[PDB]
Design an enzyme around this catalytic site. Structure first.
Site, PDB file in Angstrom:
ATOM      1  N   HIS A 135      31.211  37.404  38.991  1.00  0.00           N
ATOM      2  CA  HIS A 135      31.579  38.516  39.960  1.00  0.00           C
ATOM      3  C   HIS A 135      32.443  39.452  38.798  1.00  0.00           C
ATOM      4  CE1 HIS A 135      30.580  36.212  43.420  1.00  0.00           C
ATOM      5  NE2 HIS A 135      31.358  37.019  44.358  1.00  0.00           N
ATOM      6  N   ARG A 168      39.018  37.065  42.827  1.00  0.00           N
ATOM      7  CA  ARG A 168      38.524  35.959  42.513  1.00  0.00           C
ATOM      8  C   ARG A 168      39.354  34.728  42.398  1.00  0.00           C
ATOM      9  NH1 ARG A 168      34.785  35.349  44.874  1.00  0.00           N
ATOM     10  NH2 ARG A 168      33.588  33.986  43.573  1.00  0.00           N
ATOM     11  N   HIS A 174      37.757  30.865  41.339  1.00  0.00           N
ATOM     12  CA  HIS A 174      37.701  30.945  39.631  1.00  0.00           C
ATOM     13  C   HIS A 174      39.216  30.546  39.132  1.00  0.00           C
ATOM     14  CE1 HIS A 174      33.931  32.309  38.739  1.00  0.00           C
ATOM     15  NE2 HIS A 174      33.727  33.247  39.785  1.00  0.00           N
ATOM     16  N   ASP A 178      38.433  32.635  33.708  1.00  0.00           N
ATOM     17  CA  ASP A 178      37.130  32.873  33.963  1.00  0.00           C
ATOM     18  C   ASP A 178      36.941  34.147  34.240  1.00  0.00           C
ATOM     19  OD1 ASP A 178      36.554  30.022  34.172  1.00  0.00           O
ATOM     20  OD2 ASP A 178      36.784  30.254  36.396  1.00  0.00           O
TER      21      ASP A 178
END
Lengths: 217, 219
Positions: A135, A168, A174, A178
């Site tokens: 993403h 995220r 996440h 990440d």
């Protein structure tokens, strides 16, 4: 058709460092980051995170139109509309593939048994390597491409790009590391795309649609 | 030799970067722990690399990247690439990070802990310069990206070396881990801005043929 094939992306498993381990300072931070986001659950920033979680073109368009300052629709900006989907395939998937598959990093919501800000995707994510965030790579790439097409909005785009990735973390899908890794991945793929003619061709047209007086807001 | 663009033409870093971590922020706890993990390997091979990475003189930057990009970078063999290296330092290392740097004037870790860095000679200068974000990192990331554009089959090595260049600032004690994570994004943002500048595109074209010339290829 995608700008390049899966094999034409720069191998992320080679240039990214391995994921933070159980006792690494970065991992202690990842856990702290995870709980800070879980604590503000239900709040507005949490809701925003749920919106940023949806990567369908309709939603990306809704989110970036105000930031780039131009209408984005399959009708008014047809090339920009394909660019958004094309970038998702090569940036969110292709560029993150090898690193993701090699480490199969477990997602925080799975490790701590909590649901995320967007329960729909929880089942798909469970089987997807957490490191690095696709993403994030996508939203970073998107921000850089649109900054190239409409530089007068560079700062707004760089800012929103960043917050899209932070969403995220707050969402619980996440770990902070990440997302940090995903941003670098996004920049590397952006540099790779510049050497692909199909992309240069597409960008020229995107630049034309977003700077069109008939499309500005 | 003239900057691809003026200071005012860099995207305002103070606007898109978040503020550096506060004293009781979990991220600053990470910055301090990271700092000590680096101080710990003082004297190792990686620590040696970090000290060599600290010298941003065009001479040293050429030495470091020639093997990675796979070509001899010199003022004689690669005139345009030599200028590119210095032009990027100016717009990427300084212009691109100036406002956030001045805005926060963050203290550096070696000063805070009253320790020496891996490059004592530059401390008096680093002492006067805001720590966040890292200009060294922004420049090395930018440079890795620019060279990946001129010699794409070397993209993975350049990507890796650019990343480690940033980590050397952390290990050297000159920057917090957060100054580095931020500088990487700054380098990327600046890289995107450069794509819209004619002076850049023209310089890149020459750099591309210079670095792919059969005579400058390195193994």
């Amino acid at each position: 058709q995608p700008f390049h094939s899966p094999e034409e992306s720069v191998n992320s498993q080679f240039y990214l460092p391995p994921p933070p381990g159980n006792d690494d300072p970065a991992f202690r931070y990842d856990k702290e980051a995870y709980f800070k986001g879980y604590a503000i659950k239900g709040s507005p920033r949490w809701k925003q995170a749920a919106e940023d979680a949806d990567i369908s073109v309709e939603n990306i368009a809704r989110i970036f139109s105000p930031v780039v300052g131009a209408k984005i629709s399959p009708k008014d900006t047809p090339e920009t509309w394909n660019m958004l989907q094309n970038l998702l395939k090569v940036g969110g998937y292709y560029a993150t593939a090898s690193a993701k598959k090699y480490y199969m990093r477990t997602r925080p919501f799975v490790l701590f048994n909590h649901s995320t800000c967007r329960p729909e995707d929880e089942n798909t994510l469970r089987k997807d390597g957490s490191y690095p965030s696709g993403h994030t790579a996508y939203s970073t790439l998107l921000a850089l491409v649109l900054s190239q097409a409409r530089p007068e909005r560079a700062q707004e785009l760089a800012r929103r790009g960043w917050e899209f990735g932070q969403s995220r973390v707050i969402c619980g899908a996440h770990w902070q590391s990440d997302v940090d890794a995903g941003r670098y991945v996004g920049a590397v793929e952006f540099a790779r795309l510049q050497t692909i003619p199909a992309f240069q061709k597409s960008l020229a047209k995107v630049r034309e649609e977003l700077n069109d007086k008939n499309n500005l807001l």
